[PDB]
Amino acid sequence: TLHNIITDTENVQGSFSKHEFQAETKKLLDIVARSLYSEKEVFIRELISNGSDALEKLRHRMITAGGAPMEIHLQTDSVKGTFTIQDTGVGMNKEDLVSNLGTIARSGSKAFLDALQNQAEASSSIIGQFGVGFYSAFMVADKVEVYSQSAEAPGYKWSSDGSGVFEVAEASGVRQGTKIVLHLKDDCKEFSSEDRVKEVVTKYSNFVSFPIFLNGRRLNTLQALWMMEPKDISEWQHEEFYRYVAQAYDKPRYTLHYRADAPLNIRSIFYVPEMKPSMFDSSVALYSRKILIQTKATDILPKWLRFLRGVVDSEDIPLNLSRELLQESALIRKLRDVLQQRVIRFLLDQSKKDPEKYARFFEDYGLFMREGIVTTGEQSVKEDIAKLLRFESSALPAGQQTSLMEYSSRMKAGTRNIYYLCAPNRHLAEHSPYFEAMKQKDMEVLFCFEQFDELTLLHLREFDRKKLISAERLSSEQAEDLLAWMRNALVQRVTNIKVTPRLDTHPAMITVLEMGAARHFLRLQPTLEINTGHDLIKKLHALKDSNPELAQLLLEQIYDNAMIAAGLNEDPRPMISRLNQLLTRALE
Amino acid sequence: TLHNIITDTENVQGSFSKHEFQAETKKLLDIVARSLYSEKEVFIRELISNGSDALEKLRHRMITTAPMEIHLQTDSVKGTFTIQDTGVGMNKEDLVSNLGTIARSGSKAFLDSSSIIGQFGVGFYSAFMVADKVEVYSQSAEADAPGYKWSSDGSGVFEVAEASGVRQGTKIVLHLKDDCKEFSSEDRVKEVVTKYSNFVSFPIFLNGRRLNTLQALWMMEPKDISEWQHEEFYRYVAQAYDKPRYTLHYRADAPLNIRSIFYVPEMKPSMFDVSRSVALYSRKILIQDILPKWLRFLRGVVDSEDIPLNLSRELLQESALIRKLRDVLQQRVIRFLLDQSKKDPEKYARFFEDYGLFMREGIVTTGEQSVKEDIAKLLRFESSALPAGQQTSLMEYSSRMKAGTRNIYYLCAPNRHLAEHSPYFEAMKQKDMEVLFCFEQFDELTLLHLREFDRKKLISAETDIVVDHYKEEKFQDSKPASERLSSEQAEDLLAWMRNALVQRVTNIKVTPRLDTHPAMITVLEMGAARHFLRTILQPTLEINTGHDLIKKLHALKDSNPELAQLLLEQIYDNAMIAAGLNEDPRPMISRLNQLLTRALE
Ligand SMILES: Nc1ncnc2c1ncn2[C@@H]1O[C@H](COP(=O)(O)OP(=O)(O)OP(=O)(O)O)[C@@H](O)[C@H]1O
Numbered sequence A: 001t002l003h004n005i006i007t008d009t010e011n012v013q014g015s016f017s018k019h020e021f022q023a024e025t026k027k028l029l030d031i032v033a034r035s036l037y038s039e040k041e042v043f044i045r046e047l048i049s050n051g052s053d054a055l056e057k058l059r060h061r062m063i064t065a066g067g068a069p070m071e072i073h074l075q076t077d078s079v080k081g082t083f084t085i086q087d088t089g090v091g092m093n094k095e096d097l098v099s100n101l102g103t104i105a106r107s108g109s110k111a112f113l114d115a116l117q118n119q120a121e122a123s124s125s126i127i128g129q130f131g132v133g134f135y136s137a138f139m140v141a142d143k144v145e146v147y148s149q150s151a152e153a154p155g156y157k158w159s160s161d162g163s164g165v166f167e168v169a170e171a172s173g174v175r176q177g178t179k180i181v182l183h184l185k186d187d188c189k190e191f192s193s194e195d196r197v198k199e200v201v202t203k204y205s206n207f208v209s210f211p212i213f214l215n216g217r218r219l220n221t222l223q224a225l226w227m228m229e230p231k232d233i234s235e236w237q238h239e240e241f242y243r244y245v246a247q248a249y250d251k252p253r254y255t256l257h258y259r260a261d262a263p264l265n266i267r268s269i270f271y272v273p274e275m276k277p278s279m280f281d282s283s284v285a286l287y288s289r290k291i292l293i294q295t296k297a298t299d300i301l302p303k304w305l306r307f308l309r310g311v312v313d314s315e316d317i318p319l320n321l322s323r324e325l326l327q328e329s330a331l332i333r334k335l336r337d338v339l340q341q342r343v344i345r346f347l348l349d350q351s352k353k354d355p356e357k358y359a360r361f362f363e364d365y366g367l368f369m370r371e372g373i374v375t376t377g378e379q380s381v382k383e384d385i386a387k388l389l390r391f392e393s394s395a396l397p398a399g400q401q402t403s404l405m406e407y408s409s410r411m412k413a414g415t416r417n418i419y420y421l422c423a424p425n426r427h428l429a430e431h432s433p434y435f436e437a438m439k440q441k442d443m444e445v446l447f448c449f450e451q452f453d454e455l456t457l458l459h460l461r462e463f464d465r466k467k468l469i470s471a472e473r474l475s476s477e478q479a480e481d482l483l484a485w486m487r488n489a490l491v492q493r494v495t496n497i498k499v500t501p502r503l504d505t506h507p508a509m510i511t512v513l514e515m516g517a518a519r520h521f522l523r524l525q526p527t528l529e530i531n532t533g534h535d536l537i538k539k540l541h542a543l544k545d546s547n548p549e550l551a552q553l554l555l556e557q558i559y560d561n562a563m564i565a566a567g568l569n570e571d572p573r574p575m576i577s578r579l580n581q582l583l584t585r586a587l588e
Numbered sequence B: 001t002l003h004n005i006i007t008d009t010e011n012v013q014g015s016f017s018k019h020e021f022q023a024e025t026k027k028l029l030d031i032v033a034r035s036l037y038s039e040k041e042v043f044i045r046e047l048i049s050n051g052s053d054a055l056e057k058l059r060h061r062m063i064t065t066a067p068m069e070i071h072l073q074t075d076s077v078k079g080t081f082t083i084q085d086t087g088v089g090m091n092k093e094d095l096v097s098n099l100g101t102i103a104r105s106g107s108k109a110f111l112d113s114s115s116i117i118g119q120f121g122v123g124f125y126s127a128f129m130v131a132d133k134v135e136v137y138s139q140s141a142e143a144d145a146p147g148y149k150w151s152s153d154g155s156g157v158f159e160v161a162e163a164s165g166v167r168q169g170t171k172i173v174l175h176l177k178d179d180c181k182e183f184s185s186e187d188r189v190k191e192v193v194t195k196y197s198n199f200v201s202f203p204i205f206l207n208g209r210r211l212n213t214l215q216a217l218w219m220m221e222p223k224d225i226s227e228w229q230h231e232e233f234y235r236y237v238a239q240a241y242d243k244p245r246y247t248l249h250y251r252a253d254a255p256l257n258i259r260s261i262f263y264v265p266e267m268k269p270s271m272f273d274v275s276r277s278v279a280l281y282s283r284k285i286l287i288q289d290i291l292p293k294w295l296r297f298l299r300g301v302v303d304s305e306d307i308p309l310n311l312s313r314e315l316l317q318e319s320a321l322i323r324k325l326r327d328v329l330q331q332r333v334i335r336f337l338l339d340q341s342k343k344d345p346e347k348y349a350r351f352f353e354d355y356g357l358f359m360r361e362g363i364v365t366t367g368e369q370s371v372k373e374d375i376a377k378l379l380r381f382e383s384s385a386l387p388a389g390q391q392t393s394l395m396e397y398s399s400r401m402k403a404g405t406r407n408i409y410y411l412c413a414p415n416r417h418l419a420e421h422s423p424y425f426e427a428m429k430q431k432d433m434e435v436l437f438c439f440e441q442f443d444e445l446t447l448l449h450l451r452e453f454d455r456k457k458l459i460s461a462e463t464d465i466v467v468d469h470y471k472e473e474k475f476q477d478s479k480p481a482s483e484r485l486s487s488e489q490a491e492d493l494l495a496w497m498r499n500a501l502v503q504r505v506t507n508i509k510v511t512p513r514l515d516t517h518p519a520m521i522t523v524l525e526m527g528a529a530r531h532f533l534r535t536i537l538q539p540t541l542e543i544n545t546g547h548d549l550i551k552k553l554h555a556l557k558d559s560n561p562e563l564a565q566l567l568l569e570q571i572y573d574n575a576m577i578a579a580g581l582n583e584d585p586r587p588m589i590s591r592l593n594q595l596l597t598r599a600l601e
């Protein structure tokens, strides 16, 4: 029932020829100047990047052959519609003008990197690699003019329109550096506006090492903090940087400055906002050699760590030809694993340095850990994230938190079972029929009140090589006569009316068998328990026959009071109208 | 004060020399095979699309009969991926010019329909990402041509030799490198085909078995698609098991080219996925926002011939068109959802009950006022001029308003019975205005961010009651003066209440606007006060001197003064609960139980 035509029937017949690969140049220029970048505004990023490379080469030459400042200069002409950019770097002679700008995929900045020592400072700051970034000017310009003056012993002019030809001629007088003039298109006249160009520079090239002037005014007044020593950075510097990199306006409660040299080069700073996120609403930016690649990174961090803010910079991460994506690499997948373990080991340290501060962190961002244990499919990671979880216990007072490592610490030496009971509040967990069995023979049980706590431990399955298993006055006849009267007035409200001695001050309480049904009600088969020794109960027994219309309101109120005290009713607005009627009839 | 270097000073000296742009071919192939495509798997997509182009060149050629299909074979033992199509094939000249030249595309000179995927001329070189050796056997059409074998290692050179036994078409054999042994697996290759090339207009065979290629339903007439076809297509693009309750098949040619299908799942949206969706295609090939954040519940596919692709075929090149395309789709979905309330209001009442949280998000998280009001047309409330259970909208509220009115009054309550008997509604019934009833949790937060609708201000009932104090309090009680406390008995009672509620209320005043309730708490910005408590204030207690509970409170302060204070604290708590401003209602049960005991003798 199969059908395939691929068969080994071909054989080499005769001799063969030899040819080299070619390249249609006229078509290739159009590819770079159109179908390469998702935005037209990219040309500003590349021309500034090519200028910074020219500035870095001159700085490196002045180390051994030391001899004006550096920095790059821009200018916009809103009338003629021209975008001009000029650096005062190394420049280019006539040979380097025809070789570099005239040949696609040729990058003199790449050959410069391969000739330097790997310890040289310019070896980790040159941006060029491929050799096509310059041709992004033809995407927004009908005519490109380049003036350059080399640092050796005449200036030249490089002019082209992007149609497969260019002209070179002498010029005078060209300043030491390289000047580029872009006669913008009609649909690209927005790039002659000082405001629009300023928006583009602050997006990609805001952290260039050298100063950047726009019509005579400096822009990039911001320094890359992820490149400095974590000790020489003050707290007010991180607070000022977090508001920029995260587009927020508060202070980062946690700050992680990670610097590693084992997988590639990691110069990253992570933040945790102090304000809790909500519905009425950036992420971690990806830089490479101080240039923005992705505003919201996708491959370097897991999904459950998207609440982190900051920036991750890598000098040797495989970049895409568009400089806005990353290549599929085993180095990037291992980078995500190292970062996941570092953030876990970092938040664990904050839980020991300040449990009070970590408890505030787990209340706001605790849902991300519960999301991580469920989403991931690696069991060793599910237990690494579980070390961050916090729960209340049955053998501990209310309001105090403990970890799964603390629970396994206090367990009996002859047992290896983690027992938990996920209930709404504590009044429903302490009065659980499945917990009362674990209160006699068995010992400790975890109380998980937070949302999505059940399926988190259900997807956790195993922790610390151990299983998590969900642990799931009035006479004797005067009460029964009152019981039979309460069941008839509460037919379709509760399913069982009991009498228990544990009440004293409260005339009633609400206990529920299954806690999964208690959450579905809060999205039910309650058990109303009555104290035959309370004042309101003995008044209810005496008013069920003397004033049945008055005892009907009291019964409905005692049930509602037990529902509120049990957390089942948090908005007692429906009872206000009936409660006011009870007070007036009780104050006659 | 300024520092500029650029000055018009350069002048051309001597004549110029003309040159031609050149290309470094050895490094061009290195860029394609390493730094062009972000994911290695796309080499299967490019080779399949090259076979679909060759088959389309034969489809157009057969109309001046042979099988037209694509075959894939995986050899995990020899580490070999083989693709063979029965298309036009290439002669010796085509093998050297089309394949041996970067950026050269024979699928461009073929011009003179819209079923050819080839464009740039570099897609064939995507095989070198995963293969050390590429063998290509091609046979031209019925013509004066023999068979040939195209061979290359991927480094600068290639060899072409004549071959026999070359079937009509083209066969490419990829000797996979050890880095990419995943592509010699049948399961892995089938994942790549169904991802990118699941809508190819030709059959695809993998190791002998025919792959279930689907049909591009977004490129066909809507009136030729049955409900059962939209069911099966929704279960694929959304990867679901249910069926869509709504189906929008929107096509357009102005101002943009749009060929899209949208679905609304009949399942309620999982609350775990809301805090934690529509594909994009082009020429039946998968491409990887397009819809606003509040429309993330919709599932489907959007196609547009006006969206340019990049070289790697994974990026959209017009962020302004994407922003314009997003607004056009938003207005269409708004009209589509508005037409669903007209045809079946009961079904839309279910959809608004399951997805209404998305429409409220799109109103709060939007800066444009007109977008706030366009989405607001989808909201549904109940009116005080309509029977219980009947839903209405802001549009229907605006038509009922008289010529003199200029505001839209609304009231938020848990259910209908509380809104009809709310103390804030009894004060509104003295007016002749219509009041909307909002029962959802985040309805008041939405109407505060909406602010106005159709130049009419949204005023909550609790706010309008506070404003009338600063105007003419020309209202009258529901009971005659014989049933109320006298002015001497009222001031004597008001002074005692200010002393027992010193630091809990700003001031206490009498109001003639209550009938059933003894008191109510009024705050100016009541809507924001309820939102701020979801983590004191300046509240105002307004008593009803005709209520039996207040008249008894005036007498209790002289017969049982401690019982009167416990009652006053309870009236304040009840007025705070009914206002939605109550904190934790559990610590008050103690005083309530103690108050009910002393009252019941
Ligand atoms: N402003 C400038 N001053 C001096 N040299 C320059 C300038 N701009 C470009 N060049 C030279 O021209 C060459 C062409 O660079 P091109 O922009 O084509 O690629 P790249 O910048 O090296 O790398 P990428 O293609 O990744 O941007 C570079 O190697 C560089 O040495």
Ligand SMILES: Nc1ncnc2c1ncn2[C@@H]1O[C@H](COP(=O)(O)OP(=O)(O)OP(=O)(O)O)[C@@H](O)[C@H]1O
Pocket: B046, B050, B051, B053, B054, B085, B087, B088, B089, B090, B098, B099, B104, B105, B106, B107, B108, B117, B118, B119, B120, B121, B122, B123, B124, B125, B169, B170, B171
């Ligand atoms: N299997 C095949 N049979 C016959 N002709 C082919 C085959 N594959 C490619 N060709 C021809 O050789 C040319 C080589 O094109 P190539 O695959 O390199 O890029 P492209 O598909 O034209 O461009 P892009 O992939 O960027 O759209 C094509 O134009 C096509 O006409």
